[PDB]
Enzyme design. Structure first.
Site, PDB file in Angstrom:
ATOM      1  N   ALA A  80     -12.437 -18.471   5.213  1.00 25.28           N
ATOM      2  CA  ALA A  80     -12.973 -17.860   6.412  1.00 25.28           C
ATOM      3  C   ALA A  80     -12.462 -18.214   7.852  1.00 25.28           C
ATOM      4  CB  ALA A  80     -14.831 -18.092   6.554  1.00 25.28           C
ATOM      5  N   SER A  87     -10.332 -15.763  12.063  1.00 21.63           N
ATOM      6  CA  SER A  87      -9.634 -15.748  13.769  1.00 21.63           C
ATOM      7  C   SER A  87      -8.439 -15.092  13.602  1.00 21.63           C
ATOM      8  CB  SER A  87      -9.746 -17.062  13.929  1.00 21.63           C
ATOM      9  OG  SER A  87     -10.914 -17.765  13.774  1.00 21.63           O
TER      10      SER A  87
HETATM   11  C1  HEM Z   1     -14.165 -14.330  14.663  1.00 24.38           C
HETATM   12  C2  HEM Z   1     -14.603 -15.022  13.650  1.00 24.38           C
HETATM   13  C3  HEM Z   1     -15.496 -14.530  12.589  1.00 24.38           C
HETATM   14  C4  HEM Z   1     -16.143 -13.469  12.530  1.00 24.38           C
HETATM   15  C5  HEM Z   1     -16.170 -12.225  13.014  1.00 24.38           C
HETATM   16  C6  HEM Z   1     -17.059 -13.787  11.436  1.00 24.38           C
HETATM   17  C7  HEM Z   1     -17.965 -12.960  10.698  1.00 24.38           C
HETATM   18  C8  HEM Z   1     -18.903 -13.113   9.690  1.00 24.38           C
HETATM   19  C9  HEM Z   1     -19.935 -12.390   9.419  1.00 24.38           C
HETATM   20  C10 HEM Z   1     -20.359 -11.105   9.718  1.00 24.38           C
HETATM   21  C11 HEM Z   1     -20.691 -13.251   8.192  1.00 24.38           C
HETATM   22  C12 HEM Z   1     -21.958 -12.763   7.592  1.00 24.38           C
HETATM   23  C13 HEM Z   1     -21.700 -12.193   6.059  1.00 24.38           C
HETATM   24  C14 HEM Z   1     -22.930 -11.562   5.498  1.00 24.38           C
HETATM   25  O1  HEM Z   1     -23.964 -12.328   5.709  1.00 24.38           O
HETATM   26  O2  HEM Z   1     -22.875 -10.998   4.543  1.00 24.38           O
HETATM   27  C15 HEM Z   1     -19.841 -14.245   8.243  1.00 24.38           C
HETATM   28  C16 HEM Z   1     -20.369 -15.327   7.206  1.00 24.38           C
HETATM   29  C17 HEM Z   1     -19.595 -16.463   6.977  1.00 24.38           C
HETATM   30  N1  HEM Z   1     -18.554 -16.839   8.055  1.00 24.38           N
HETATM   31 FE1  HEM Z   1     -18.014 -16.034   9.488  1.00 24.38          FE
HETATM   32  N2  HEM Z   1     -16.875 -15.014  10.676  1.00 24.38           N
HETATM   33  C18 HEM Z   1     -16.244 -15.573  11.833  1.00 24.38           C
HETATM   34  C19 HEM Z   1     -15.367 -16.963  11.691  1.00 24.38           C
HETATM   35  C20 HEM Z   1     -15.675 -17.728  10.877  1.00 24.38           C
HETATM   36  C21 HEM Z   1     -15.136 -19.057  10.796  1.00 24.38           C
HETATM   37  C22 HEM Z   1     -14.220 -19.815  11.704  1.00 24.38           C
HETATM   38  C23 HEM Z   1     -15.649 -19.639   9.615  1.00 24.38           C
HETATM   39  C24 HEM Z   1     -15.490 -20.999   9.018  1.00 24.38           C
HETATM   40  C25 HEM Z   1     -15.132 -22.111   9.651  1.00 24.38           C
HETATM   41  C26 HEM Z   1     -16.436 -18.809   9.022  1.00 24.38           C
HETATM   42  C27 HEM Z   1     -17.278 -18.841   7.930  1.00 24.38           C
HETATM   43  C28 HEM Z   1     -18.055 -18.055   7.369  1.00 24.38           C
HETATM   44  C29 HEM Z   1     -18.985 -18.190   6.247  1.00 24.38           C
HETATM   45  C30 HEM Z   1     -18.799 -19.386   5.131  1.00 24.38           C
HETATM   46  C31 HEM Z   1     -19.940 -17.294   5.853  1.00 24.38           C
HETATM   47  C32 HEM Z   1     -20.821 -17.289   4.932  1.00 24.38           C
HETATM   48  C33 HEM Z   1     -22.072 -18.172   5.338  1.00 24.38           C
HETATM   49  C34 HEM Z   1     -23.346 -18.134   4.603  1.00 24.38           C
HETATM   50  O3  HEM Z   1     -23.164 -17.360   3.385  1.00 24.38           O
HETATM   51  O4  HEM Z   1     -24.258 -18.844   4.880  1.00 24.38           O
HETATM   52  N3  HEM Z   1     -16.682 -17.464   9.818  1.00 24.38           N
HETATM   53  N4  HEM Z   1     -18.969 -14.522   9.041  1.00 24.38           N
HETATM   54  C1  QR8 Z   2     -14.131 -14.264   0.242  1.00 27.19           C
HETATM   55  C2  QR8 Z   2     -15.343 -14.055   1.046  1.00 27.19           C
HETATM   56  C3  QR8 Z   2     -15.904 -15.159   1.560  1.00 27.19           C
HETATM   57  O1  QR8 Z   2     -14.829 -16.271   1.679  1.00 27.19           O
HETATM   58  C4  QR8 Z   2     -16.325 -15.260   2.897  1.00 27.19           C
HETATM   59  C5  QR8 Z   2     -17.454 -16.488   3.175  1.00 27.19           C
HETATM   60  C6  QR8 Z   2     -15.647 -15.172   4.145  1.00 27.19           C
HETATM   61  C7  QR8 Z   2     -15.975 -14.178   5.175  1.00 27.19           C
HETATM   62  C8  QR8 Z   2     -16.233 -14.985   6.591  1.00 27.19           C
HETATM   63  C9  QR8 Z   2     -17.334 -13.525   5.154  1.00 27.19           C
HETATM   64  O2  QR8 Z   2     -18.406 -14.098   4.795  1.00 27.19           O
HETATM   65  C10 QR8 Z   2     -17.450 -12.019   5.007  1.00 27.19           C
HETATM   66  C11 QR8 Z   2     -18.014 -11.431   6.380  1.00 27.19           C
HETATM   67  C12 QR8 Z   2     -17.538 -11.528   3.726  1.00 27.19           C
HETATM   68  O3  QR8 Z   2     -19.032 -11.528   3.516  1.00 27.19           O
HETATM   69  C13 QR8 Z   2     -17.280 -10.012   3.783  1.00 27.19           C
HETATM   70  C14 QR8 Z   2     -15.696  -9.878   4.170  1.00 27.19           C
HETATM   71  C15 QR8 Z   2     -17.231  -9.616   2.428  1.00 27.19           C
HETATM   72  C16 QR8 Z   2     -16.968  -8.079   2.363  1.00 27.19           C
HETATM   73  O4  QR8 Z   2     -16.453 -10.199   1.603  1.00 27.19           O
HETATM   74  C17 QR8 Z   2     -16.793 -10.835   0.465  1.00 27.19           C
HETATM   75  O5  QR8 Z   2     -18.079 -10.741  -0.054  1.00 27.19           O
HETATM   76  C18 QR8 Z   2     -15.721 -11.804  -0.077  1.00 27.19           C
HETATM   77  C19 QR8 Z   2     -15.680 -11.767  -1.374  1.00 27.19           C
HETATM   78  C20 QR8 Z   2     -16.354 -13.156   0.054  1.00 27.19           C
HETATM   79  O6  QR8 Z   2     -16.122 -14.068  -1.070  1.00 27.19           O
END
Ligand code: HEM
Ligand code: QR8
Ligand code: NA
Length: 396
Positions: free
Chosen positions: A233, A238
Site C-alpha cells: 500500500a 502514492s
Molecule cells: C493516496 C494514498 C492512498 C489512497 C487513495 C488509499 C486508499 C485506500 C482505500 C480506499 C482503502 C480502503 C479499502 C476497503 O476498506 O475496502 C485503503 C485501505 C488501506 N490502505 Fe490506503 N490508500 C492510500 C495510501 C496508503 C498508504 C500510504 C498506506 C500505508 C502506508 C496505505 C495502507 C492501507 C491499508 C493497509 C489498508 C487496509 C487497512 C485495513 O484493512 O484496516 N494506504 N486505502
Molecule cells: C493487495 C491489496 C492490499 O495490499 C491493500 C491493503 C492495499 C490497498 C491500499 C487497499 O487496501 C486497496 C484499496 C484494496 O482494498 C483494493 C485495491 C482491492 C481491490 O484490492 C485488494 O483487495 C488487494 C487484493 C489487497 O490484498
C-alpha cells in the site's frame, strides 16, 4: 448469464464509466457478476449506501475469504490479511502499527519528507527537460518513505515492486502466478522481521518482530502479513496517485496554473483530486451481510455480498455540487477516497503528506511544467486493481 459483468468494461485513463451515474440515479444497488469466485454481488454506487456497507458491523470482510465468495481479483483473499479481519481482532491488528500513522506522527515526518522531495527534484533539474516524472519522483519518493518507515532495504525496490504489482493484479496474471508471489512475499517479509529477532530495530518491522514474541491474540501470519500490506500500500498508492494528480493538473492546464498562482490551494486540491480519481479501477474488497441490512432501495439479506465503487460514491450529486466538475474551492469535501469504517486507510495521513509535498514542490519550483508526450500514447497500467501511469514525460 442473467446479470451483467463487473467491471462493466476495460478502463480508459481516469474516466468514470457513464453507467455509474445512470446506476446512481435509477438503480443505486444492482446485481453484478464479479470476475472471480461464484454467484452474484450487490454493486453500491452512492455515498450513503457506501457509508453503510463499509461502516456497519452487520457486514463482515472475514466472511469474504470463502473461495466461492465473489471478488475482483484472481486469488481467494488471504485470511491473515488486515482487509479480511473483522473487529475486534481487526482493532488489535491495527494497534500493532497504528501509533506510527496518526496525523500527529505523520505531521512530524514533513521535514525529512520535504528534504527527500527536494533531492529528487534536484536530480531531475540535473538531468534536464524533458524527463520522466515517474522515474525521477513518483517511484523513488514514496518507495524511500515506506522503506525508512518499515525498515525495508531501499536496494530491494525492484524485488518488492515486482511482488507488489503481481499482488495488485486484476487480469494481467493468473491465480497460480499471484498465489506463488504471495508465498514469496510472505517468506521474504518473514525473513526481514526474523533479522530483528536478535537485533530489534526502531522500525515498524521492529514493532512487528516484538509482537511475534509476546502477543497472544495474533498469529505470526497476521503480524507478518501486516508488513506486506504496508509495504504494498505504502508505495503502490502514492506512486499511482502522484501520476494521477499530475495527469489531472496538466491535461487541463488552468488547474496547474491555479496552484502555481496560489501554492496554499494544494492541500484542498489534493482532497479534490482524491475525490475525482478512480485510483481503485473498479469495486473493492467485498463485504458479506451477516444479517439483513437496509440500503437505500433494497434489504441485503444475510449471506449476500456487496462491493462498492469508491469513485462513484465520490461523484454522488446528492453530497457534492457539480460532482462531475473538478473544483479546488469546495467548502466541504466528505469523499471516501480513503474508505470508511473499520478498514478506513491507516496510511491516509501519510498519503496526504506525500501528495501535498510532491505537488507543493512541483507547483512552486516548476511553473512551466507541461506534458511533453501526447495524451493519446500515455502508458496507463492495464489489468491491475489500481490505475496510474507507467511513465509521464514532462518539460519545463
Ligand atoms: C493516496 C494514498 C492512498 C489512497 C487513495 C488509499 C486508499 C485506500 C482505500 C480506499 C482503502 C480502503 C479499502 C476497503 O476498506 O475496502 C485503503 C485501505 C488501506 N490502505 Fe490506503 N490508500 C492510500 C495510501 C496508503 C498508504 C500510504 C498506506 C500505508 C502506508 C496505505 C495502507 C492501507 C491499508 C493497509 C489498508 C487496509 C487497512 C485495513 O484493512 O484496516 N494506504 N486505502
Ligand atoms: C493487495 C491489496 C492490499 O495490499 C491493500 C491493503 C492495499 C490497498 C491500499 C487497499 O487496501 C486497496 C484499496 C484494496 O482494498 C483494493 C485495491 C482491492 C481491490 O484490492 C485488494 O483487495 C488487494 C487484493 C489487497 O490484498
Ligand atoms: Na474480496
Amino acid at each position: 448469464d442473467a446479470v451483467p459483468a463487473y467491471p462493466f468494461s476495460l478502463p480508459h485513463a481516469l474516466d468514470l464509466d457513464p453507467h455509474y451515474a445512470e446506476l446512481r440515479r435509477d438503480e443505486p444497488v444492482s446485481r453484478v457478476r464479479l470476475p472471480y469466485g461464484e454467484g452474484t454481488a450487490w454493486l453500491v454506487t452512492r455515498m450513503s449506501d457506501a457509508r453503510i456497507v463499509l461502516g456497519d458491523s452487520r457486514f463482515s470482510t472475514a466472511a469474504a475469504t470463502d473461495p466461492a465468495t465473489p471478488r475482483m481479483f484472481p486469488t481467494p483473499p488471504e485470511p491473515d490479511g488486515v482487509l479480511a479481519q473483522d473487529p475486534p481482532d481487526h482493532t488489535r491488528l491495527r494497534r500493532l502499527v497504528g501509533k506510527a500513522f496518526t496525523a500527529r506522527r505523520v505531521e512530524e515526518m514533513r521535514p525529512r519528507v520535504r528534504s527527500l522531495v527536494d533531492s529528487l527534484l534536484d536530480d531531475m533539474v540535473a538531468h534536464g527537460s524533458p524527463a520522466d516524472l515517474v522515474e525521477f519522483l513518483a517511484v523513488p519518493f514514496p518507495v524511500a518513505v515506506i522503506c525508512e518507515l518499515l525498515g525495508v532495504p531501499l536496494e530491494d525496490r525492484d524485488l518488492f515492486r515486482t511482488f507488489s504489482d503481481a499482488m495488485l493484479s486484476s487480469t494481467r496474471l493468473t491465480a497460480a502466478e499471484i498465489q506463488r508471489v504471495q508465498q514469496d512475499f510472505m517468506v521474504y517479509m518473514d525473513g526481514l522481521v526474523a533479522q530483528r529477532r536478535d537485533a530489534p530495530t526502531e522500525d515498524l518491522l521492529g514493532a512487528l518482530a516484538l509482537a511475534t514474541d509476546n502477543d497472544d491474540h495474533l498469529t505470526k501470519g497476521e503480524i507478518v502479513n501486516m508488513g506486506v500490506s504496508l509495504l504494498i500500500a505504502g508505495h503502490e498508492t502514492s506512486v499511482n496517485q502522484i501520476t494521477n494528480l499530475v495527469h489531472l493538473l496538466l491535461t487541463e492546464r488552468k488547474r496547474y496554473e491555479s496552484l502555481v498562482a496560489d501554492p496554499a490551494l494544494v492541500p484542498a486540491a489534493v482532497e479534490e483530486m482524491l475525490r475525482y480519481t478512480p485510483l481503485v479501477s473498479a469495486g473493492s474488497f467485498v463485504r458479506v451481510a451477516t444479517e439483513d441490512v437496509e440500503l437505500s432501495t433494497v434489504t441485503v439479506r444475510a449471506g449476500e455480498p456487496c462491493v462498492v465503487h469508491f469513485a462513484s460514491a465520490n461523484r454522488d450529486e446528492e453530497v457534492f455540487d457539480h460532482a462531475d466538475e473538478l473544483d479546488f474551492h469546495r467548502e466541504r469535501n466528505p469523499h471516501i477516497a480513503f474508505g470508511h469504517g473499520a478498514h478506513h486507510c491507516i496510511g491516509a495521513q501519510l498519503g496526504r503528506l506525500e501528495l501535498q509535498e510532491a505537488l507543493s514542490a512541483l507547483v512552486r519550483r516548476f511553473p512551466t511544467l507541461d506534458l511533453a508526450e501526447p495524451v493519446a500514447g500515455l502508458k496507463w497500467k492495464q489489468g491491475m486493481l489500481i490505475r496510474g501511469l507507467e511513465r509521464q514525460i514532462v518539460s519545463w
